[PDB]
Structure 1
């Protein structure tokens, strides 16, 4: 497996729920980057160096993902709820002495990120979310068209062992097909082959796949219920926010986030749903300018 982060160290960070793995580089104000599904921290390999010019950049594997430990789940999928993941990553950041930091997330990591901002806004100076709407909004939008487009939200959330059993027959094909399907190009050409190998190796492990299903089960149930409480309470994120999204993938995303946050700017980028790899120069530029 290739080292795709020149000048970055490798850290295992202890928490009460298990170790969080991170690549760490740069100096200056602290910036945490959180990947999503079906990827690992290495999805930031194209943009993290530009960020590390100006920030101390911490590129973490989500709880249960990549090389992070996998806490044992339960009947409500608790450690893979975004609330729980946010609490664990707040603990990890405290181990480094970071109790107020900047945060950017993509996909599931962006879900952790806006949940973190709702639950513990004092932890964040600035927030970026990439290629997402709140989990509540996806579910509110779930008609025939959406059930077909984002079928994996219901499929991966089916009670165990249904998706686990299916995913084990040929995991390489499934993860490579998802990676390609969600890009503008519809193939693997936006990715570094070395990064695809990281994703494939992670996805090849049945325990790692079970975590992903627990993540989507949380997304269908507890995450949705947490979001619903905020909607009903009229809670809006007060942290300055940036919403970025691939125009060919979230997509009016800024209209949606304005209902969820009181200080948000945003922009589409010509890309599918893997912005930091499909449009790394654009994405890095927007993030550097926002966080500075």
Structure 2
């Protein structure tokens, strides 16, 4: 078995509003990789090493997730976490960079691209469309499948009380569900996800993410829609192979948010980074190579 993140240098960055866990490797154009829920930067362990052969790779734990913490009533909106990313990359020497996000990290990523277009050279979303589009699609089956979007958004401290009683049960159930029962979690990465979820501050930060998704994040998306503001960089979307209702296909949705869009279906679960790393890498590498001028 290969080790986890060979040659990555683990850092703690001190920013205006947060203490952020960052891991870096490589040389060349900069890429920032942003995990999702209920995970940490280790979700990238099957992808980041290959990328670091050709690029400067930065992995971060999102504010409140993993080992990253707000300095503190902290703001856990996507806009705030986007500012964390600008500050992170700037501290490391990068004023403009590509962003590759999965799940909540893709939500941070597109909000960064909309708010700070000068900073984002290219954007890749794994599984995600803007939250405004998600909310428009809510129906019975949406709400059953994604029940946690509604639970975790309830007022403080309802969901924290429910998910906090036996955190590892809930974490493990959630990861199994998201993976469709597939054996995709490296046992050591799993212990890291578990440790983070056992921290009440992490669980709270996750609920705040979901609260923001209902409220300020959706309001920000609507304001950009109203203004006709689009992402300015090339966009790639890689989506789970599953049926999409009319108007809900991720490629169609991204074309309403960006003028330069491509993508592909991947035959895996929602957990693309861990479940289908080779497929993801093929697509990522091709995209970054085809837009090599954009990265300059």
Q: Same fold (TM over 0.5)?
A: yes
Map of 1:161-200 to 2, 5 A cutoff? 161-183=157-179, 186-187=180-181, 189-200=183-194
Asked whether the equivalents of residues 131 and 249 of structure 1 are also in contact (C-alpha less than 8 Å), the reply is no
Give 1:249 deviation, angstroms. Answer: 8.7
**Partner residue, 2:294:** none
**Partner residue, 1:129:** 125
Give 1:37 deviation, angstroms. Answer: 0.6
Structure 2 gaps, min length 5 = 290-296
Give 1:171 deviation, angstroms. Answer: 0.9
Asked whether the equivalents of residues 79 and 108 of structure 2 are also in contact (C-alpha less than 8 Å), the reply is yes
Among 265, 280, 285, the residue aligned to 2:282: 285
TM value normalised by structure 2: 0.93
Give 1:3 deviation, angstroms. Answer: 6.5
**Partner residue, 1:231:** 225
Distance in 2 between residues matched to 1:272 and 1:128, nearest whole Å: 18
Distance in 1 between residues matched to 2:210 and 2:264, nearest whole Å: 27
Note the alpha carbon deviations across 1:220-254, whole angstroms, 9 max, x for none.
Answer: 10001001111222221111111011214987110
Give 1:43 deviation, angstroms. Answer: 0.0
TM value normalised by structure 1: 0.94
Structure 1 gaps, min length 5 = none
Map of 1:1-292 to 2, 5 A cutoff? 4-73=4-73, 79-183=75-179, 186-187=180-181, 189-248=183-242, 252-292=249-289
Note the alpha carbon deviations across 1:197-234, whole angstroms, 9 max, x for none.
Answer: 11111101111100000110011100010011112222
Give 1:18 deviation, angstroms. Answer: 1.7
Between stretches 122-131 and 229-238, larger displacement belongs to 229-238
Asked whether the equivalents of residues 248 and 271 of structure 1 are also in contact (C-alpha less than 8 Å), the reply is no
Note the alpha carbon deviations across 1:65-117, whole angstroms, 9 max, x for none.
Answer: 1111224325xxxx210011101210111111110111101111000000011
Distance in 1 between residues matched to 2:221 and 2:22, nearest whole Å: 28
Distance in 1 between residues matched to 2:192 and 2:285, nearest whole Å: 26
Asked whether the equivalents of residues 34 and 59 of structure 1 are also in contact (C-alpha less than 8 Å), the reply is yes
Asked whether the equivalents of residues 19 and 71 of structure 2 are also in contact (C-alpha less than 8 Å), the reply is no
